[PDB]
Amino acid sequence: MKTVVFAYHDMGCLGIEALLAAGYEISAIFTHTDGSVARLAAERGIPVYAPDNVNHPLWVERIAQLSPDVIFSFYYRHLIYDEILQLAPAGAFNLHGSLLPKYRGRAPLNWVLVNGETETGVTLHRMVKRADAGAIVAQLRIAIAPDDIAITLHHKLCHAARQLLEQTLPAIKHGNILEIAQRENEATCFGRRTPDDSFLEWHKPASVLHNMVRAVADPWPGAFSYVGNQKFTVWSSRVHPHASKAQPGSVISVAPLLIACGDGALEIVTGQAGDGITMQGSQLAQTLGLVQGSRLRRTRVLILGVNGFIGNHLTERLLREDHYEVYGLDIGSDAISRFLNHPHFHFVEGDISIHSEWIEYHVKKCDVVLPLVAIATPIEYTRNPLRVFELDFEENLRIIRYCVKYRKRIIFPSTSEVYGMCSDKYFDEDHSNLIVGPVNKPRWIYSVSKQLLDRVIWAYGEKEGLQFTLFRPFNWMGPRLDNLNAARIGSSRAITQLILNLVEGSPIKLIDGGKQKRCFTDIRDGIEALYRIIENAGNRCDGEIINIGNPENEASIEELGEMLLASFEKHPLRHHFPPFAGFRVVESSSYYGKGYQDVEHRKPSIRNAHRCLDWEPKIDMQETIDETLDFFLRTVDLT
Amino acid sequence: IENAGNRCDGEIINIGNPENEASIEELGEMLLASFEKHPLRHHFPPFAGFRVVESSSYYGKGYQDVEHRKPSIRNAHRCLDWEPKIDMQETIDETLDFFLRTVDLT
């Protein structure tokens, strides 16, 4: 047949050779920079390439040009995806280093040693949308010797693969292959191991620890531990069922260097202190200062604009956990006064444009900064564009810079408005284009400002190591989303403005028909997701942009007005307010002034949220409507 | 700058020749054609040819581009009574000549 190969490292060479010996014609080989696959390719006169992303249109089109019958993947590191895979009529097969569906993850060579398996093997399966799930075309078992280590098991596997391909490859050349599907309810998956995963925890059994040192023995990074401040690596181990009433982690002897484990002791045969040379355990013991003795505050969150809608709710949330200390500054304090007595809450009434000593000192002193000061009520974009620009953009750019100056993590609040009039069904943080209108449509000044800030934060991240996370709220609402008073000037979001209407007995106006829709998110859902981001479990939020909204609560403004009215009519306090003045369609210009333009639909992709936070919106819209309505109605003084 | 009749106040004006639309590939050909006919041609090495490349390998990660760009020159006509005149090929020649005579030959 005619094929295009994706190979790298050892398996890559033996695979390209088996492929050649089997009579295949290799049109091209895709590999990586740094047995060299490239060297082999060059030696055999096979055009070799090493782009960063072969999934790029140009490559896909060029691979399609070669018109391959089948595609093979022998330890290719980057990920080849569907688009190109299906360019081969005979299919695409990948050679995985484990007994699938077991250890279908990555680094199976090491994991099988970590978990101390008795056997492993090689598997040639078909490539499908799911990683390592495709139908198995051939497999082959391998026995793991009690004294095998990563490198030695690697050759075992290489040899096994050389044999598996040797015989099952001629089979594919023709078509005698059985797609024995994978027993999905038996598949095990593992992820990339970082050198921090080879840490030795002496409380575990000597056996477990021993397999660890084997799993990552040279040429791998190795298993390590600490002698006080000093870090050392264990290259050779040796389990001793020889008990020792000694507590785990304590040195039983220095010749041999025997450490007491949770079960039995482990003998460090060879290792090295720090980046020094390898030496026998007895010597390593001395160079580390060992004798018979044992081996191996809360988070400050700064919230600017803490009294705001997002601010006060986030404070309540954080103040529930004990590992948080909350520092906040704001112009107002009615929403956070209830926390003033809390020991872990430190509030101060200030202005981001005036109180520099406090702000700078705290960005310097805290661990995470949440710059929530802003003006986010659309009427203000057209009415006071410059005030919006100066506060939303300039004032914040200053905080962003304090953060890079003092190397602090910044969880900056982006906005769903950054997508503008995007046309995708789902506004995607990593793929959607951003669309705004002409310069003569000033409503977008906000959108554009927030986007430039997102881009600056991104550059700082890329070019200066700033640790960040951008989050984009999608029409969050609930109690304290603005206030009826600000609403009297149009300075508030829809929901809270329509409540003022029902309260004062004025009609609910639906700007341009009110057919445009949005995805309303309950503030409780939003704060939970945000809380998760602050938690930043596993650092899965670094450099990430995360939308937060409930795609399930999509509704037109007209529907929002109806749902609100329905609740309002059933409310206990209803009789206190005037009779409904009705819904009335109005030209946007008559409410927002010249220069207004809007978004016809807004629904978020919440994939990233699911991936980084394991978050999912839960509260349904109607409930949010009730909560919000109730809060504001009981804000009205009745006398 | 003249702002005759203040017809440019508060105006945004595109300035381009919608008549000179061309792909970069065509720009490269037109340039090459002129280059081959140029008096100074013999001073420079033989053409190494055209080669398609991934944007990433030239601009780095994070590059994206514009597939087409043509301006409306209504405002220009209305506020300035202006209309592009020079054709692209002439601009190519001018530019090529200038830069070729920028090269020190010795």
Ligand SMILES: O=C(O)[C@H]1O[C@H](OP(=O)(O)OP(=O)(O)OC[C@H]2O[C@@H](n3ccc(=O)[nH]c3=O)[C@H](O)[C@@H]2O)[C@H](O)[C@@H](O)[C@@H]1O
């Ligand atoms: O939280 C959100 O995701 C976004 O909310 C607002 O922007 P937007 O949703 O466009 O505007 P709202 O004031 O919340 O109202 C939505 C739409 O309802 C309509 N509306 C509003 C008020 C009213 O009385 N009548 C009416 O028909 C308007 O067309 C308005 O654009 C903010 O401007 C954004 O910064 C924020 O990201």
Ligand SMILES: Nc1ncnc2c1ncn2[C@@H]1O[C@H](COP(=O)(O)OP(=O)(O)OP(=O)(O)O)[C@@H](O)[C@H]1O
């Ligand atoms: N100059 C300023 N100095 C300090 N705080 C300010 C200043 N200007 C505005 N603020 C504060 O910013 C806070 C946050 O704004 P607000 O609550 O109106 O919206 P938000 O919660 O960010 O809304 P969304 O989440 O919908 O964008 C306000 O409570 C206000 O006190």
